[PDB]
Design a protein around this ligand. Structure first.
Ligand SMILES: Nc1ncnc2c1ncn2[C@@H]1O[C@H](COP(=O)(O)OP(=O)(O)O)[C@@H](O)[C@H]1O
Ligand SMILES: Nc1ncnc2c1ncn2[C@@H]1O[C@H](COP(=O)(O)OP(=O)(O)O)[C@@H](O)[C@H]1O
Ligand SMILES: Nc1ncnc2c1ncn2[C@@H]1O[C@H](COP(=O)(O)OP(=O)(O)O)[C@@H](O)[C@H]1O
Ligand SMILES: [Mg+2]
Ligand SMILES: [Mg+2]
Ligand SMILES: [Mg+2]
Lengths: 369, 372, 24, 370
């Protein structure tokens, strides 16, 4: 009777909506803004917590805080407030008691994060049922194929999950924390080295916009590094310009070379190829011909070409490789969650309120993955 | 042996001397003063612009500009004047005869170092030169090769961890809150107290008040309560005129902005939190050693009680088992220069110079390949 | 308008808005 | 107390008193005390010894003037107490001070002791039921009826710029300089001495101020105007004689924008406005340029708006909208905003009660403001 609610809990942007809808109707950034300046006049903006488009409109006034980092919830009160705002009147006007929830968690996350998320979604919101899911299965559901390897690169994490004919290899899952937010932080550092400083929390969101707009992945790193580059100019919100120069392309290369930021982790291409290669041999070809991209961080200009080149370098010689990707990558996971939640069999995958009241966290560990 | 000059161009104060010496030969504020009045006839013995102590003595009529702001040279003509005064007037040495080991803060603009090298090689025609990170030199001065240097001067406060001589560029943390910001906050709170200081000349008076009277409170709230309930902390200072002005709680509110940037309006971490974050960015194995070798540097770390406050704050933040040891040598104000002199007195450093031949071959950009 | 007619220093015969030309 | 609050905009040059109900300040007069010029001991001379308000204007030639407030700071507290008592006179407001609560106005970033002593005077000498001290920059936006803007209050004594976004004030972005109307009057006196005209007396400070108010304009291109032959506008003194002001007409107010001509170490009105805008957070800056509100008497200079627009244009980023909202009532905008604020029921929760001041002591008036 009550349509389940699908909440893709992105680290950068959270996407809430109803199951069965074509696109996530209620998308907004996953941060909480608080007014740092002092209120003097009557009739000022009300409330000391700003979430959603109100925060975006008055972004300069507020100081931003991110409840989620690298797929793990750090400030749990802020995450609780965020999910409460998802049920608010502004977005998705409902009552949390009536609607089962479909929350998405990054793979290989700590068990404590999942336990606390379930506790919040069963105690603070007295939902009838809950079901945690990974991004990869939902992306495959959205694209409509049971077979493939999902490389999802979000704001906090980037993970490769191979699933063959609906069977997931838990040991072949690969994950690194170098993701889009780390690219934005590296870009902030490089912009400081250029001359422009963005130390403010609000100005970090300007740096993120610069990352979204003026940044690309050169097909070959060192040739572009050697050659002089024209200084493309970007317009800041106030009106002043900035000449970016090499930081246009030296920033996203962090995704392929984590050692740029001093982290000794595999690159995104290495993540993909090792995720394929850890699986059984007989599936590898079928995995190489079915690669599904997701996450906003794979929208860099030239990401497809550089990823194809890197995988071709690392993959066995003469093996068919096609890198598929949905036309709208940001909403793919939520659309998948909606397609999953509409299934009758989803009722069998629930964690009912009685089940969580009886078994507790163990039940959440039994029915999740 | 031709001694190489060492010129620490601080944001506020320029120091200069010869390699191998114990202390800088010349130590003068890095200011360029210009006369304020234009229309009226000018007297007999006058200069178009004054530099260093000459500007400081005559600051009553002059208007002062700092060439370096937040560790970035914004006025290159003024900085060229400062270097000319340093070499010809103060040191009294031909720049073309000796190499020069300049200093710069970490994470500065690349164009800053490039223009520094270009000015040194073209205008002054030095036979060679080098640019060194201030924190590395200050660690050299302390006789250590492992530790975390929190060097805080007039313009910037930068934290650099080093382990066994191997720097860790990804754990360096820079803050624009240092010195000048504290002087401006002291101006503001003084204005609330009643004494209004607005002109650039009065900035020197407020800076002198900060140097003489201000101190770091071990416990901020307790000292605030003591100031409110008693006048024991009130201390009197004499202006150059002769006016006596009493400073109360403002003695320990000006340096408190080091540990609470929210007073200055910046949503940044304090120096204790910056140091702790820089330590935590390092690998787990070396962190203990850094906790045992925290080194304070720069002139702004000369407040009384800053070592105890930093030790308390880091001990609160850090795990209980680890032993914290803030090293605050008495001569730390010059520690950035002294290590530089050591770095210029080493025999192995003759290969680290940027010779003029290499500068002509590769241009200014070689500074990014050689120095750091 | 006339409610401020009696005050001495009300500067009239001037525009109330000095602004740059609009751009589309 | 349910009685009508009394709003007293405390100008350095001109104070404006009235009741909160009124749309305009019904009472307003210069902020100075006029004493007899000679030390009167004989009879038949100007009696009373204390001439305030239009009385001082009636016999202005014979009086020595003394302003209590300088740079928005009270200097002679006895004179300020006399001024405030005169506000509660038969001439002005014809009322007892004990009946009505009071709303003061004070310049930003002023000494704490000034506000403390003002509260002590208003609570001890006058048995006022309550008190509240506001900044004029906050009140200008109340008067204009908008929630956001950059208020550039250039009064007689102090010129300060304050940005507010959606009712949130930026305390660290506030800019303040002491070059204001009185300093322009002093520079006009110097330039008129250069014309050959002497105004040595303190009373003659009033007529050179009148000359400033009457014939002084800000030229968009001062060099071209100086090169161009001036019309030498004629001005009538109170006694009857005429004076040709000459090029000084455009030279005195120019120091507001470029004080360094006279060696003053000050930012300048356009400089403080632009730096107050730029010190704020970046995302707000465009909106702060789109809402600039003028206030104070010094903004009433002829051609002031055009020159300020030109300076802000050449200092602001290119192709950025600027709107210098200069209402015609900008001289009394601060009082009108104070009246609008005091009319609100929320004002009931803002002023400090007399018992609250007696119990909590001084710090109450510091803490209830923010
Ligand atoms: N066109 C683009 N170019 C570069 N980066 C982009 C682009 N579009 C989105 N992003 C990045 O993608 C991130 C959002 O990823 P998202 O898919 O929301 O993560 P999650 O899966 O956690 O929701 C943002 O941080 C943004 O910087
Ligand atoms: N004894 C002292 N007590 C407090 N502050 C001091 C003292 N000595 C110097 N300072 C402060 O340190 C600053 C100078 O730091 P300095 O070491 O010159 O940095 P830099 O080398 O980057 O110029 C000055 O602004 C001054 O306020
Ligand atoms: N039309 C005018 N032209 C020039 N100056 C003026 C004009 N009208 C008023 N003034 C000046 O403005 C000053 C009044 O400022 P005011 O608004 O009282 O400041 P405050 O905020 O201190 O009340 C007077 O000293 C006067 O010289
Ligand atoms: Mg995701
Ligand atoms: Mg230093
Ligand atoms: Mg006023």
């Amino acid at each position: 009777a009550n349509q389940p609610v699908v909440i893709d809990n992105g680290s950068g942007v959270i996407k809430a909506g109803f199951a069965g809808d074509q696109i996530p109707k209620y998308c907004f950034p996953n941060y909480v803004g608080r007014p740092k300046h002092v209120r003097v006049m009557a009739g000022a903006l009300e409330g000391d917590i700003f979430i959603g488009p109100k925060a975006e409109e008055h972004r300069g006034l507020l100081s931003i805080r991110y409840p989620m980092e690298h797929g793990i919830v750090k400030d749990w009160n802020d995450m609780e407030r965020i999910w409460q705002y998802v049920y608010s009147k502004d977005q998705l006007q409902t009552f949390s008691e009536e609607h089962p929830v479909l929350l998405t968690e990054a793979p290989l996350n700590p068990r404590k994060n999942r336990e606390r998320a379930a506790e919040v979604f069963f105690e603070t919101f007295n939902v009838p049922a809950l079901f945690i899911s990974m991004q990869a299965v939902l992306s495959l559901y959205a694209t409509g194929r049971t077979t493939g390897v999902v490389l999802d690169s979000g704001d906090g994490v980037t993970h490769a999950v191979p699933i063959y004919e609906g069977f997931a290899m838990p040991h072949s899952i690969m994950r690194i924390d170098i993701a889009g937010r780390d690219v934005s932080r590296f870009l902030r550092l490089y912009l400081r080295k250029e001359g422009y400083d963005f130390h403010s929390s609000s100005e970090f969101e300007i740096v993120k916009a610069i990352k979204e707009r003026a940044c690309y992945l050169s097909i070959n790193p060192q040739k572009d590094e050697t050659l002089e580059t024209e200084k493309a100019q970007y317009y800041l919100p106030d009106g002043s310009t900035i000449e970016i120069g090499p930081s246009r392309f030296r920033a996203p290369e962090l995704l392929f070379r984590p050692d740029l930021i001093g982290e000794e982790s595999e690159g995104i291409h290495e993540v993909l190829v090792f995720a394929i290669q850890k699986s059984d041999m007989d599936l590898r070809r079928t995995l190489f011909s079915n690669i599904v991209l997701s996450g906003g961080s794979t929208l860099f200009k030239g990401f497809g070409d550089r990823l194809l080149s890197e995988v071709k370098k690392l993959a066995p010689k003469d093996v068919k490789i096609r890198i598929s990707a949905p036309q709208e990558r940001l909403y793919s996971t939520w659309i998948g969650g909606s397609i999953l939640a509409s299934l009758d069999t989803f009722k069998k995958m629930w964690v009912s309120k009685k089940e969580y009241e009886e078994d507790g966290a163990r039940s959440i560990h039994r029915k999740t993955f | 042996d031709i001694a190489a000059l060492v010129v620490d161009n601080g944001s506020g104060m320029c120091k200069a001397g010869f390699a191998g010496d114990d202390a800088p030969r010349a130590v003068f504020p890095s200011i360029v003063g210009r006369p304020r009045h234009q229309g009226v006839m000018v007297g007999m013995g006058q200069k178009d612009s004054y530099v260093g102590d000459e500007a400081q003595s005559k600051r009553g009529i002059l208007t002062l500009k700092y060439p370096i702001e937040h560790g970035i040279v914004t006025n290159w003509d003024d900085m060229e004047k400062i270097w000319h005064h340093t070499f010809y007037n103060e040191l009294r040495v031909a720049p073309e005869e000796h190499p020069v080991l300049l200093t710069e803060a970490p994470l500065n603009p690349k164009a800053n170092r490039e223009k520094m090298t270009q000015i040194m090689f073209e205008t002054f025609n030095t036979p060679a030169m080098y640019v060194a990170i201030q924190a590395v030199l200050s660690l050299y001065a302390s006789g250590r090769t492992t530790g975390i240097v929190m060097d805080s001067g007039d313009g910037v406060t930068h934290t650099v961890p080093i382990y066994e001589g191997y720097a860790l560029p990804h754990a360096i943390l820079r803050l624009d809150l240092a010195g000048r910001d504290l002087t401006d906050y002291l101006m503001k709170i003084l204005t609330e107290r009643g004494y209004s200081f607005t002109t650039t000349a009065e900035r020197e008076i407020v800076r002198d008040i900060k140097e003489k009277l201000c101190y770091v409170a071990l416990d901020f709230e307790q000292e605030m309560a003591t100031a409110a309930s008693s006048s024991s902390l009130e201390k009197s200072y004499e202006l150059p005129d002769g006016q006596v002005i009493t400073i109360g709680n403002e003695r320990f509110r000006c340096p408190e902005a080091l540990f609470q940037p929210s007073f200055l309006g910046m949503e940044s971490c304090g120096i204790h939190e910056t140091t702790f974050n820089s330590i935590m960015k390092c690998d787990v194995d070396i962190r203990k050693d850094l906790y045992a070798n925290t080194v304070l540097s720069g002139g702004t770390t000369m407040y009384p009680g800053i070592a105890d406050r930093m030790q308390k704050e880091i001990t609160a933040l850090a795990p209980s088992t680890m032993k914290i040891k803030i090293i605050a040598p008495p001569e730390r104000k010059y520690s950035v220069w002294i290590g530089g002199s050591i770095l210029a007195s080493l025999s192995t450093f003759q290969q680290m110079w940027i010779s003029k031949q290499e500068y002509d071959e590769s241009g200014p950009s070689i500074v990014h390949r050689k120095c750091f | 308008d006339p409610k401020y007619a009696d005050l001495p220093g009300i500067a009239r015969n001037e525009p109330d808005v000095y602004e740059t030309s609009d751009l589309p």
